[PDB]
Design a binder for these strands. Structure first.
Ligand SMILES: [Mg+2]
Lengths: 1341, 380, 245
DNA sequence: ATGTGCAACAGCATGATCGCGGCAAGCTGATCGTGCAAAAGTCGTGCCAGC
RNA sequence: GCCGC
């Protein structure tokens, strides 16, 4: 109840100090949920394949009265499972079956149909599926897909830092970004002119687009400005009063209110005068005529006498114009505001710049600017403008785009048309003018509320949509030439482009890369990875200093610690433990609701925008029993800041202290005691560890090991756990209990563990059981632990006894000193697996045969080859041994006498057939593990192929017959009970087979009903098992459909053990790394007064400068834990009774200062206590959470419990001199990992090899036997030394002097040591290159 | 595809402007020159060594005569005595026995490099190698009497001789058997033996040509429109490739139509189809069809991988109508192999058997068919 | 300008070959169309085509927004692939790769002198192969070069003895990849050690800016009397003790 | 008092942006038909020399 | 491209 079966075997001592509200999520929910939403059926057309089909289908020809109606779709069962798919090297995918019908409409009768062919489902392409762990097995690989962090479609306003024209003038711009389509932009000139940049083309005034929307000059001036009315009647020339707008202005003359002076000429302009004027109800008042001189007419007043009128908008007025309008009777004149206090002159200047005022003129102008080719004919311009924006299939903002668009402009409605209208462009322009005016502010583009996440499902949906559009384009053509005989497969189903697009996206993309397979931690980290790069992302060199900086919005969403170092720092991030993605695609993080002064248990997920308003408390703020805050003033985040608030002003609380760290950074104990960058290095280095031979749990952990181990999927977890029936190194069979059971056919659970298997990084993957026999298990318990996992806990390192002291300079700088005892116990010894393959491929001259006998090959070479030419399993091959014996034919149809006598003396071939055999590459050694020969259909079966097929059939029958045995035993038990009910012969009945001829008939009812039904069920069971067995046999024995050219394939695996050595690299999980300097003998290492030497010696000089106190704290804590473990081991050694041992374990499990763990041994069974105590001989595995855990006092009392000094330092004696070191030395246990950088892959040397055809210089890199590159800086250094002869021998003799190389080699062999230089080939190549142009360059004498 | 191979070894030169650059390979002649450059030779000796190693074939034997080498030198005091010494020095290089004039010399030099105490050194040094080599080619029943030695000793001397390398210098080759078969013409078995074509890449080429040429033309960055600058080159290329694939498919369909029986039941059922037979079928001239189907290759479950192997005009004056000499040769090979241990296989007897079977062929032709790819089993 | 080989006998033309082929095609078509007395419009178009092909061959990426092809990547013209970054960076002007060069991870040796470094014997016996061949042929252990080569291949004990004899006073020079000043490359006297890691004297780490947490070095052999004297009398670690800045 | 010459400002195109090393991954193709003489090449057939 | 210095 309190603890599960897998946890009662070994309980970590949690230091706690704070309860946990909600548990850590599945840690893999993003990829799983995204692909589930992409794949699963949806009754509505919301998302996925159904959404794409509804987007394109239904489709009809151009008035051809023929349409294809789409109804539902399905995915067929995969033809291979995951394991055999990986072992074969093929893609794991499912066929796509789509059901659609052809309808033929009546030509004579409108809206009538004549035919309706409802043909069955058809096939187009195969959609790859993801495994249970979120991986896409394509081409026999893993190929995880990385999520992308991009800018959400919508509207963004920016100020470009206001430094472009060097005048200090800040420039505002607005951008409209759709999900798919062409961008739109607005910009501000330094002369304050509205300019647009459509599709990033040359800048044009906004007035062309503004007029293209059927907007006249009067209407634009009316909508974009607040027009005022000027009344000139009986020469009074009054003005309407708008005191609200009249804020800043100078009175040109005396201002009187209803004939009484209100404001004098040039009087006070303060708010008091405005308030006094507004208080008095005053009608229109007269003004001096000089004020109207600067005014501009807005409307276009018409003269009632003659058709002539002053329609010149955006123009001032003249003194004669006043008389002209008075003659026409214009009593009221409409003029815009023309006030510059907060508003200003806009839009009008752009209309003055551009004189086009017609929709046709604007359309042709934008057609010329967009397309500088052929001028339009009133149809090209209209159609092109309709295609640019406001087109259903050309321009499209997603629902998130519409949401952001409406929210940024303060519109209540969220949902809306997915295509932009006429009004929103006007609203955007008005908003930009508003920001320029002063009201409003620019938004942050690095704000996490403006950045979205694209997962695998959405990208796959987009690729499928593109492919289906391409298919549709071809489909539309055929319908014009369609008769009634055509069906759906004959209607251009076109699987080719669907499959091509989908496979191109999955197999070859920037965001679909090989997944890391070192540890489960690297797989977990890679799966939940956020990347800013990609197709639609931001490139490395385009990234400024601000996009790769941590933001105050990164709190509970992305980790500020985990990130790559050099190129991609800040561009690749990792999700936090509790972070999850909103419905629209924005990051979220949970918080606890706070009501009054008590924090509640209900949990709300807040995004980046919502959390910006509330006041959020801290996770590590103390609370009372009732939930109230124990102190009045608490620390909170209000708006991107930190300050103290009252106990009542808070609104939310953090769920836990791990909210801001990712999975990788959660496994670092004492993270708060490490420097940020060194902890970054430690977190990045924890993922490069190599799983060892034997797993070893960490003594000082965190408690996240169980979650990482279970959620990664390397282990084997029970799903309907009952009791364990049969155990083996390769199988576990569990008898599911009766309480939960599927009715009928009984049922058992069979788990086939994956033995030694090559991973992506050429490491080893192996699973071994954890249950012994007859041991009851529950659902979710761990049965087998995969690579680097001990009893269901992440264990990717080993517990090393460490002394912090300088030792004769052998730990100088970052080096590490290691004892020989560490080497002897095979710690840090890893298994590496390699795959080698050879293919027999047909040729014109004849087929390629794989045979044991190899011409011109001695008998010693054929010793390790079988009768079929394939190595025996288990043979140890080194150097250049032959693996597969393959012969290539040669062509000769002219039998000359010498070849005739050659054939006479020797075999019929006379060794004409060349040999091309798969040999081990030099420097590679190991034991042959597996051979996986594949053959084509029709070709003769290989001799070993029969043996492998036999073993596969044996395994299938062995794992299939268990359920048959169970079912037949149940049937026999039922028959025995029936015969016991009547006419029981007991042992006499049990002795004869077939229930002693079904116990005759006995009673009529039993014979007619019981015995007959039992016999019928028995026969049906036999027939069912038999058909299933021959189905398995047929599936096993088949000819693999190979490539048209290939004929046979053989794959060979080699496994080798890599031991530790001075060249190897070793590092802890606190950012402290190094290389081994020496493997010291046991008697030379320092020892304490008990004679036990240390295993590792490190330098104290590396602690203070790097600022890692977690190192020392973990060392002390590991020493305390191992002291308690030693006490338990010693007390178990002396055969002490169970009572005292239980008392000691209970005392050790109740330590700490009010921890939240309540483990008690009172309810523990005695055998359970014995097993748990036997599991703590090697140490007590205590756990400290990330930002709360053990303190100095608790560590010291833990030390005092185990009879160890509280200072953490003991007296060491020199193993060489026998003298005691003058000062005490810090000794303890530190968890040390083994990184993937070994000198067996980093040691290289070359004297002579191969050179390129061009420039004749040595090749580069290992596996090609290349030479080290002597770059430009090395030559600069040689020049600065004055070494001219060394430089000359570097440039000519060693690299490019073709004759010089041979001459110098001949001199060296003879012993001359003479140079004889020449002309490098590269200069000749350069001369030929320059001469290949029209330029002549020559070497004059 | 149930089983798919892992990607074959391939690479391309990166971070280097002349992409793919190259990679030097070491051949037999290059290795011989490298060995020559590291031994003390005079200038005349060096010239002779270069001249004689230039003539080394792929198998490691000298193709040109020694007197012809002397004539090639064309200088006095370089008579055959000197070139003989130089060649004999050259022979003892890393592929021991390389640059050998004949088989006898190769065995002599191979046996020379030994402990001089092997059980049958003098037995096969000259009695077997330098003499009665033709006898050793046959059963060598009279060789024991000729050499005055017991047959038991010869039974081990023959094995000792066979222990030597027959063709030294062929273990140095660095070429890779990458001359695999594209099989651009794929074929599967159906109710009518349908024939398809793979590796067309026509949709891919069309898409790439579009996205490049029409992509630049549709792009509005350049002034005007590239309606013919780039758009009207991809169309020409696509049309040419489509026409080529169409005529190839038509020729293949004609070939399978006239040669259905070769693929059905027995393999040796080819009609003697001529170029005019397909020319009239496809209404195209014979020259184009001959140039089209002269190295194109098909992928058949049982038939040969070629498109010219079927094109035979070998009527051979068959009794009933006409026949193909390919089937006649196949039948002769099958019958000759399946015969008595004596295996007479006489040309007259084979011709009589073929005539009885219905193939009216002269006794002199059958000798040519047999000698093309076989030898008479003691028919003389 | 070699053309790339593919699987089978197929050959794929490189970018320069494509440019030359296009220029030749345009020239041939223009020549054949000139003699037909065609209207001047198509003559004008074909002359423009030939000119554009010539500019694309000589200088890609200008006047026509590049030609690209088959991967939506610009084709490499004659000037773009002159030498590395259009200059002389990669395979000329001090960019050469060299023979007699090695590389491995460095560790610390506190027992060393200022002029000594620890050289693995597997890294040796490969850099000093021709010297070992010469010493074997000179001492009479092997007469032919083939015998000496085979004996070195079999790595017998006398081979190790001769290697130790031939390394005696031959200085070797180690450099670290970011060579910032002239002290980033120095000449030491090799000492044969068993293993795979180079043992560097701690006192030169500051000059090298080297630490033992995973760095690597490169080893070059000065195989000439003049080069040996220069490495001993100029670039020895005992020679440079004061920084030249 | 109006017209002409010269210096300055804004816009546009061009060139460059540290090394060294190890996994990796895709292949970058082809082309065209012509219908005919003119040539070279090839096959069914009969010959003499060796056993 | 990923990683190491
Ligand atoms: Mg370092």
């Amino acid at each position: 109840m309190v603890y599960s079966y897998t946890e009662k075997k070994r309980i970590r001592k949690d230091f706690g100090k704070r309860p946990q509200v909600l548990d850590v999520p599945y840690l893999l929910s993003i990829q799983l949920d995204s692909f589930q939403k992409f794949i699963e059926q949806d009754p509505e057309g919301q998302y996925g394949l159904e959404a794409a089909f509804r987007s394109v289908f239904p489709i009809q020809s151009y008035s051809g009265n023929s349409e294809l109606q789409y109804v539902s779709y399905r995915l067929g069962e995969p033809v291979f499972d995951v394991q055999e798919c990986q072992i074969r090297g093929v893609t794991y995918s499912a066929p796509l079956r789509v059901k659609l019908r052809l309808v033929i409409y009546e030509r004579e009768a409108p809206e009538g149909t004549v035919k309706d062919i409802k043909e069955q489902e058809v096939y187009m392409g195969e959609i790859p599926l993801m495994t249970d762990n979120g991986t896409f097995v394509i081409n026999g690989t893993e190929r995880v897909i990385v999520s992308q962090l991009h800018r959400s479609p919508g509207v963004f306003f920016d100020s470009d830092k206001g430094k472009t024209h060097s005048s200090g003038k800040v420039l505002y711009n607005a951008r409209i970004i759709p999900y798919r389509g062409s961008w739109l932009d607005f910009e501000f000139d330094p002369k304050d002119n509205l300019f647009v940049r459509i599709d990033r083309r040359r800048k044009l005034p906004a007035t062309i687009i503004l007029r293209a929307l059927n907007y006249t000059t009067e209407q634009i001036l009316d909508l974009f400005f607040e027009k005022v009315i000027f009344e000139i009647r009986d020469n009074k020339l009054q003005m309407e009063l708008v005191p609200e707008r009249l804020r800043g202005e100078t009175a040109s003359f005396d201002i009187e209110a209803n004939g009484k002076v209100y404001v004098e000429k040039g009087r006070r302009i303060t708010a008091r005068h405005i308030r006094q004027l507004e208080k008095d109800d005053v009608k229109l008042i007269e003004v001096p005529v000089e004020y109207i001189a600067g005014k501009v007419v807005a409307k276009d007043y018409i003269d009632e006498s003659t058709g002539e009128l002053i329609c010149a908008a955006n123009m001032e007025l003249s003194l004669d114009l006043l008389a002209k309008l008075s003659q026409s009777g214009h009593k009221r004149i409409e003029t815009l505001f023309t006030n510059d206090l907060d508003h200003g002159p806009y839009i009008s200047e752009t209309l003055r710049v551009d004189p086009t005022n017609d929709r046709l003129s604007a359309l042709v102008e934008i057609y010329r600017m967009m397309r500088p080719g052929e001028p339009p004919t009133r149809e090209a311009a209209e159609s092109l403008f309709e295609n640019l924006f406001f087109s259903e299939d050309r321009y499209d903002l997603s629902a998130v785009g519409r949401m952001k668009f409406n929210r940024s402009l303060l519109r209540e409605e969220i949902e809306g048309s997915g295509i932009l209208s006429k009004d929103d462009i006007i609203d955007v322009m008005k908003k930009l003018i508003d920001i320029r005016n002063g009201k409003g502010e620019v938004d942050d583009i690095d704000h996490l509320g403006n950045r979205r996440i694209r997962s695998v499902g959405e990208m796959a949906e987009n690729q499928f949509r593109v492919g289906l559009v391409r298919v549709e384009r071809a489909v539309k053509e055929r319908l014009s030439l369609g008769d009634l005989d055509t069906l759906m497969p004959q209607d251009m189903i076109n699987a080719k482009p669907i499959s091509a697009a989908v496979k191109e996206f999955f197999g070859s993309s920037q965001l679909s890369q090989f997944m890391d397979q070192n540890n489960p931690l690297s797989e977990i980290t890679h799966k939940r990875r956020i990347s800013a790069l990609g197709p639609g992302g931001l490139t490395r060199e385009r990234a400024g200093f601000e996009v790769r900086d941590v933001h105050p919005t990164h709190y509970g969403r992305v980790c500020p610690i985990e990130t790559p170092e050099g190129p991609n720092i800040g561009l690749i991030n990792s999700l936090s433990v509790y972070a999850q993605t909103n419905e629209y695609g924005f990051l979220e993080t949970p918080y606890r609701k706070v009501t009054d002064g008590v924090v509640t248990d209900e949990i709300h997920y807040l995004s980046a925008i919502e959390e910006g308003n509330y006041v959020i408390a801290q996770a590590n703020s103390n609370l009372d029993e009732e939930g109230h805050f124990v102190e009045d003033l608490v620390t909170c985040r209000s708006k991107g800041e930190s300050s103290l608030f009252s106990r009542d002003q808070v609104d939310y609380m953090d769920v836990s202290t791990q909210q801001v760290v990712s999975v990788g950074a959660s496994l670092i104990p004492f993270l708060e005691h490490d420097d940020a960058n060194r902890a970054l290095m430690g977190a990045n280095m924890q993922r490069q560890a190599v799983p060892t031979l034997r797993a070893d749990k960490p003594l000082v952990g965190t408690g996240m090991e169980r979650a990482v181990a279970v959620d990664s999927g390397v282990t084997a977890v029970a799903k309907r756990g009952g009791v364990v029936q049969y155990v083996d190194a390769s199988r576990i069979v569990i008898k599911v209990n009766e309480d939960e059971m599927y009715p009928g056919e009984a049922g058992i659970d069979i788990y086939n563990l994956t033995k030694y298997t090559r991973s992506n990084q050429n490491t080893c993957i192996n699973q071994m059981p954890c249950v012994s026999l007859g041991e009851p298990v529950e659902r979710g318990d761990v049965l087998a632990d995969g690579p680097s996992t001990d009893l269901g806990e992440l264990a990717l390192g080993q517990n090393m006894r460490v002394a912090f002291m300088p030792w004769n300079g052998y730990n100088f700088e970052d080096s590490i000193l290691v004892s020989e005892r560490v080497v002897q116990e095979d710690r840090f010894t890893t298994i590496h697996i390699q795959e080698l393959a050879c293919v027999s491929r047909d040729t014109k001259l004849g087929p390629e045969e794989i045979t044991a006998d190899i011409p011109n090959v001695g008998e010693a070479a054929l010793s390790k080859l079988d009768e079929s030419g394939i190595v025996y399993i288990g043979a140890e091959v080194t150097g250049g041994d032959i693996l597969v014996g393959k012969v290539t034919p040669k062509g000769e149809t002219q039998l000359t006498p010498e070849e005739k006598l050659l054939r006479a003396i020797f075999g019929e071939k006379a060794s004409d057939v060349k040999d091309s055999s798969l040999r081990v590459p030099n420097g590679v050694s190991g034991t042959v593990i597996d051979v996986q020969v594949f053959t084509r259909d029709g070709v003769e079966k290989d001799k070993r192929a029969l043996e492998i097929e036999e073993m596969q059939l044996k395994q299938a029958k062995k794992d299939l017959s268990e359920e048959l045995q169970i079912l037949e035993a149940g049937l026999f038990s039922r028959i025995r009970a029936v015969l016991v009910a009547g006419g029981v012969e007991a042992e006499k009945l049990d002795k004869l087979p077939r229930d002693r001829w079904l116990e005759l008939g006995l009673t009529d009812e039993e014979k007619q009903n019981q015995l007959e039904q039992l016999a019928e069920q028995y026969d049906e069971l036999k027939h069912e098992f038999e058909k299933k067995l021959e189905a398995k046999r047929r599936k096993i024995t088949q000819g693999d459909d190979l490539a048209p050219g290939v004929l046979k394939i053989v794959k060979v695996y080699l496994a080798v053990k890599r031991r530790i050595q001075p060249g190897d690299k070793m590092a802890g999980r606190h950012g402290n790394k190094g290389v081994i300097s020496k493997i010291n003998p046991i008697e030379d290492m320092p020892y304490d007064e008990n004679g036990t030497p240390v295993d590792i010696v490190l330098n104290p000089l590396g602690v203070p400068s790097r600022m890692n106190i977690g190192q020392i704290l973990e060392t002390h804590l590991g020493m305390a834990a191992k002291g308690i473990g030693d006490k338990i081991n010693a007390m178990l050694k002396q055969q002490q009774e169970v009572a005292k041992l239980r008392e000691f374990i209970q005392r050790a499990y109740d330590l700490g200062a009010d921890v939240r763990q309540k483990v008690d041994l009172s309810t523990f069974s005695d055998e359970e206590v014995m097993r748990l105590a036997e599991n703590l001989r090697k140490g007590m595995p205590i756990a400290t959470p990330v930002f709360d855990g053990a303190k100095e006092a608790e560590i010291k009392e833990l030390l005092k419990l185990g009879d160890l000094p509280t200072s953490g330092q003991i007296r060491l004696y020199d193993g060489r001199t026998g003298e005691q070191f003058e000062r005490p030395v810090t000794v303890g246990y530190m968890y040390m990992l083994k990184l993937n950088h070994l000198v067996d892959d980093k040691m290289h040397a070359r004297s002579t090899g191969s050179y390129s055809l061009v420039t004749q210089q040595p090749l580069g890199g290992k596996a090609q036997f290349g030479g080290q590159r002597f770059g430009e800086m090395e030559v600069w250094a040689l020049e600065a030394y004055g070494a001219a002869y060394t430089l000359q021998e570097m440039l000519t003799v060693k690299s490019d002097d073709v004759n010089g190389r041979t001459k110098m080699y001949k001199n060296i062999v003879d012993g001359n040591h003479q140079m004889e230089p020449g002309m490098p080939e590269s200069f000749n190549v350069l001369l030929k290159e320059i001469r290949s142009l029209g330029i002549n360059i020559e070497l004059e004498d | 595809t149930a089983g798919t191979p892992s990607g074959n070894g391939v690479d391309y030169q990166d971070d280097e402007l002349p992409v793919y650059q190259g990679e030097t390979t070491q051949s037999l002649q290059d290795y011989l020159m490298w060995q020559v450059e590291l031994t003390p030779f005079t200038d005349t000796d060096r010239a002779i060594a270069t001249s004689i190693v230039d003539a080394v074939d792929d198998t490691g034997y000298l193709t040109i005569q020694i007197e012809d080498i002397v004539d090639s030198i064309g200088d006095d005091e370089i008579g055959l005595e000197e070139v003989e010494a130089v060649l004999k020095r050259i022979q003892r290089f890393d592929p021991v026995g390389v640059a050998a004039k004949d088989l006898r010399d190769c065995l002599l030099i191979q046996l020379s490099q030994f402990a001089k105490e092997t059980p049958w050194l003098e037995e096969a040094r000259l009695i077997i190698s330098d003499h009665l080599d033709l006898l050793a080619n046959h059963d060598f029943r009279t060789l024991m009497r000729v050499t005055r030695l017991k047959e038991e000793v010869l039974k081990e001397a023959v094995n000792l001789i066979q222990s030597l390398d027959p063709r030294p210098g062929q273990s140095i080759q660095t070429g890779e058997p990458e001359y695999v078969i594209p099989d651009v013409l794929v074929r599967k078995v159906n109710d009518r033996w349908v024939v398809e074509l793979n590796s067309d890449s026509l949709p891919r080429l069309k898409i790439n040509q579009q996205y490049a040429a029409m992509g630049n033309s549709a792009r509005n960055d350049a002034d005007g429109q590239f309606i013919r600058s780039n758009l009207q080159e991809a169309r020409w290329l696509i049309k040419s490739l489509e026409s080529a694939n169409d005529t190839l498919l038509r020729v293949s369909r004609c070939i399978v139509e006239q040669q259905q029986a070769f693929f059905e039941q027995g393999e040796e059922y080819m009609k003697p189809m001529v170029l005019a037979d397909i020319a009239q079928a496809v209404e195209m001239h014979e020259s184009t069809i001959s140039r089209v189907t002269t190295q194109k290759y098909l992928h058949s479950p049982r038939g040969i991988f070629e498109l010219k192997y079927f094109f035979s005009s070998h009527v051979n004056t068959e009794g009933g109508g006409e026949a193909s000499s390919t089937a006649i040769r196949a039948l002769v090979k099958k019958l000759i192999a399946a015969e008595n241990p004596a295996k007479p296989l006489s040309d007259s007897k084979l011709t009589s058997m073929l005539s009885e079977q219905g193939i009216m062929v002269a006794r002199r032709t059958v000798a040519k068919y047999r000698e093309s790819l076989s030898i008479p089993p003691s028919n003389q | 300008r070699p053309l790339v080989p593919l699987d089978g006998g197929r050959f794929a033309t490189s970018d320069l070959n494509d440019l030359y082929r296009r220029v030749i095609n345009r020239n041939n078509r223009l020549k054949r169309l000139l003699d037909l007395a065609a209207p001047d419009i198509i003559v004008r178009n074909e002359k423009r085509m030939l000119q554009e092909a010539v500019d694309a061959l000589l200088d890609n990426g200008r006047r026509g927004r590049a030609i690209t092809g088959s991967n939506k990547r610009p084709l490499k013209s004659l000037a773009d692939m002159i030498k590395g970054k259009q200059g002389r960076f990669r395979q000329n002007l001090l960019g050469k790769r060299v023979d007699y060069s090695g590389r491995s991870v460095i560790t610390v040796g506190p027992y060393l002198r200022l002029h000594q470094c620890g050289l693995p014997k597997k890294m040796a016996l490969e850099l000093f192969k021709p010297f070992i061949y010469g010493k074997l042929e000179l001492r009479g252990l092997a007469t032919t070069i083939k015998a000496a080569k085979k004996m070195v291949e079999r790595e017998e004990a006398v081979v190790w003895d001769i290697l130790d004899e031939v390394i005696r006073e031959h200085p070797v020079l180690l450099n670290r990849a970011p060579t910032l000043h002239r002290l980033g490359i120095q000449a030491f006297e090799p000492v044969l050690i068993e293993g795979k890691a180079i043992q560097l004297h701690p006192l030169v780490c500051a000059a090298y800016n080297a630490d033992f947490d995973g760095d690597q070095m490169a080893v070059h052999v000065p195989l000439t009397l003049e080069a040996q004297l220069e490495a001993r009398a100029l670039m020895m670690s005992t020679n440079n003790i004061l920084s030249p800045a």
